[PDB]
Design a protein around this ligand. Structure first.
Ligand code: HEM
Length: 397
């Protein structure tokens, strides 16, 4: 197989990150296939312009916490997919990353998410009781595709029905359509909503929100640049609307096929909050990438500057080398080491909102629907990429 000289032959697998083999059997089961086999902790693929793939769990944590040799200047695959139009501070490296994260953390820290807790759970309550009487529901189109969106719009703009039609912008950045066309499709997918957020940063540059608190924030005694200010507000809409609607689908479907696990939470309701990150360990969906900065040797192979390394976070929480029996959900597990929210300086700034949205879901779904099941003979349709999409969850009770 055509490949550079510094990569061996036993470390080569044909794997498209946007369409892996066995994706129809499960996004989690498809990516864990590289662990059940006998492959080193680091593997390489010729698809999408060629890039490395970290497979072992403890190696993914080591790459995230090493920004000196793994730069964030390129986070998407293929290599030249997210150029010119860059998101902030996802595509930044320290010490440049430090001041711009303080802007996103100004409104997304724990205290700011906690002051909205009674309002967030109000959405879950008003959304569940609209179908709790009918005994069934299309969970993807009556909650998971509504509850997280309505929460973030209440914090930001309230465009009603016109942003959910535009929420496909995030679908264009994590599942575009040859590396040349992937970049050109992501190019227009990035600028079409880069122009949509432009009339929002200027009309809100005075005062009085969650995006306004970020635009009016200063950096070293001066506001942010239009390219670096539009990229920050655009990143908040991306992860805030796409990386959470997909998590609720694959979790409630798992709980619908495990009548004992849901009974464990109904008996002890305090185990929900105390075991929230156990769901994040079992169900990770993000697969971020990094560009190697300097020539480094990790896992017995040398990585040359300019290459891309993929970090599928699904191979950290589901790694049997770190978590004993990674398939079973142990709410009482002591040390559930995961990388669902990433690691290092690029930690999920909205992990507390994710932890709060999932707790107010389970606490209000089980208080009204204790027993529930998935519709028999049905299942989701899994689509991979930078952020796993997945669709098709139907519940009965
Ligand atoms: C709900 C489940 C979510 C998951 C599983 C998730 C996952 C991730 C992951 C894996 C990263 C690391 C990216 C990288 O290393 O390049 C990340 C970064 C980030 N996420 Fe999320 N995300 C979620 C929701 C959110 C929400 C609701 C927000 C709200 C704005 C958000 C804001 C961010 C930001 C700002 C970063 C970049 C942090 C930095 O550059 O230092 N995320 N997320």
């Amino acid at each position: 197989t055509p490949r550079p000289a510094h990569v061996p032959a036993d470390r080569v697998v044909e794997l498209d990150m946007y369409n892996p083999q066995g994706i129809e059997k499960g996004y989690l089961e498809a990516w864990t296939s590289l662990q059940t086999a006998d492959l080193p902790s680091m593997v390489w693929t010729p698809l999408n312009g060629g890039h490395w793939i970290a497979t072992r769990g403890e190696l993914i944590q080591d790459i995230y916490c090493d920004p000196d040799h793994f730069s964030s200047h390129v986070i998407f695959i293929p290599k030249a997919a997210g150029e010119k139009y860059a998101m902030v501070p996802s595509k930044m490296d320290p010490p440049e990353h430090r001041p711009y994260r303080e802007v996103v953390d100004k409104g997304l820290n724990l205290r700011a998410i906690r002051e909205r807790e009674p309002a967030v759970r109000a959405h879950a309550i008003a959304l569940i009781e609209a179908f709790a009487d009918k005994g069934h529901c299309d969970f993807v189109e009556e909650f998971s595709g509504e509850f997280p969106i309505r929460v973030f719009m209440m914090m930001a703009d309230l465009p009603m029905e016109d942003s959910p039609k535009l929420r496909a912008f995030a679908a264009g950045m994590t599942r575009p359509e040859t590396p040349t066309e992937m970049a050109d499709a992501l190019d227009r997918a990035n600028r079409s909503f880069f122009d949509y957020v432009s009339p929002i940063i200027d009309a809100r540059m005075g005062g009085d929100d969650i995006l306004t608190l970020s635009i009016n924030s200063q950096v070293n005694g001066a506001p942010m640049e239009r390219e670096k200010l539009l990229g920050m507000v655009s990143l908040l809409l991306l992860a805030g609307l796409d990386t959470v609607t997909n998590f609720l689908n694959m979790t409630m479907d798992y709980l619908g096929r495990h009548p004992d696990k849901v009974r464990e939470l109904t008996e002890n309701p305090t185990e929900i909050r105390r075991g929230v990150e156990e769901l994040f360990r079992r169900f990770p969906l993000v697969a971020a990438a990094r560009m190697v900065a300097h020539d480094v040797e990790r896992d017995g192979v040398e990585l040359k500057q300019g290459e891309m390394v993929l970090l599928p976070t699904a191979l950290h929480g589901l790694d049997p080398r770190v978590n004993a029996d990674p398939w079973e959900v142990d709410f009482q597990r002591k040390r559930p080491a995961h990388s669902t929210f990433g690691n290092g300086p690029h930690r999920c700034a909205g992990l507390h909102l994710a932890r709060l949205e999932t707790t107010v879901m389970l606490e209000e779904w089980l208080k009204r629907i204790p027993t529930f099941r998935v519709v028999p003979g049905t299942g989701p349709t899994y689509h991979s990429g930078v952020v796993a999409s997945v669709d098709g969850v139907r519940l009965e009770w």
